[PDB]
Amino acid sequence: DLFVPPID
């Protein structure tokens, strides 16, 4: 659910 790195 993260912006960077684009994961979760």
Experimental method: NMR
**Cβ(7)–Cβ(1) under 8 Å?**
no
Say how many residues make up the chain.
8
The two three-digit tokens of residue 1, written as one number:
């659910």
Please report the DSSP string for the chain in residue order: --SSS---
